[PDB]
Subunit: 135 residues, 3 copies
Amino acid sequence: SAKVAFSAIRSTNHEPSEMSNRTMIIYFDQVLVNIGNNFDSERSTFIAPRKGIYSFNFHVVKVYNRQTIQVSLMLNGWPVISAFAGDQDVTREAASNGVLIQMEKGDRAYLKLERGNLMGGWKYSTFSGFLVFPL
Amino acid sequence: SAKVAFSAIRSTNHEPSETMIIYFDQVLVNIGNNFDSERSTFIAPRKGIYSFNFHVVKVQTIQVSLMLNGWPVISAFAGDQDVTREAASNGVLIQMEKGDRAYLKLERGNLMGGWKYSTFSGFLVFPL
Amino acid sequence: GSAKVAFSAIRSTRTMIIYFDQVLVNIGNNFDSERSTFIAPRKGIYSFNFHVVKVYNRQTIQVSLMLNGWPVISAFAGDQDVTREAASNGVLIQMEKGDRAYLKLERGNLMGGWKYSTFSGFLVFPL
Ligand SMILES: *[C@@H]1O[C@H](CO)[C@@H](O)[C@H](O)[C@H]1NC(C)=O
């Protein structure tokens, strides 16, 4: 209803599943907040419970930054915003962006690795979201 | 009044138009219409705490300062190393009055090749 | 009233706790100790975001958001040659009354200082 919020973090440097390599969906294992449980089980897809304005924020951190990576915030399979990183030799680098989106009942919001790979594991990556107000 | 929010994106790599103000053509969210027509200015409709967030993406060292009534409040920097793209990002909460104007100014550098994928967001957290 | 909790601070000109002298917003006065410290007044979901600016070029820094002396999220800037690189991250947290949230310089020393570093947070909704 009025209180919907999720907060996830990848607490581990493990490689992606070969199921996750296909779908190109970035998943998060450690869930710090899930109010209304609309952020589902390690699929890392948010299901809008009702109509309203929602906030979204992500940071995709990588240990290996050789090849460029592009992360796109998806809405029902269509990209909304994008973040860019890679082509670096650094300690750790984050591809980060945030946006507010008007959602209708049942929309799906998730992160897709449009380009690059998650070799060496993404760790300390974050994905947050909450309902600002329903409309 | 109670529910105020905006959200905009630079959807094309087009060169800037003629004031040193970074505008965004694609508006996802505008609740209350307090974010003006295809430019960067948000006008506070009531006293309260407002959230603001911006990610200005480029393709030289540019400084983006979040302006409030003509003075800078926070600043972001994007030193151009050997990269395809780079973002100057920051965010803050500000206490604002009815009539205050928050917008993004490009203090240093220029945006050529476009500032595509740059975002700007903001909403009223609670009134006062 | 009790449902309105928000703070935001910048850094202008020990336990490795980063501080932000200029306080833009403090509603409820629950951010104190001349830094990014903040005690939750009530149980609920709180938002947090921070940008720690790596001023000097050749350094590497790591900033960890702390919850009662334990890291929750980490931000990284360094091993590069770019001036004023931001170690940034954000998270929502479930917290109870008395929980302390602050920023710790986990690795490195902010050289050239840190300036235009921001640290803000607010109560999304109580529980
Ligand atoms: C998924 O792709 C990454 C990057 O190539 C690889 O390291 C990982 O092993 C792949 N997953 C599986 C299950 O092989």
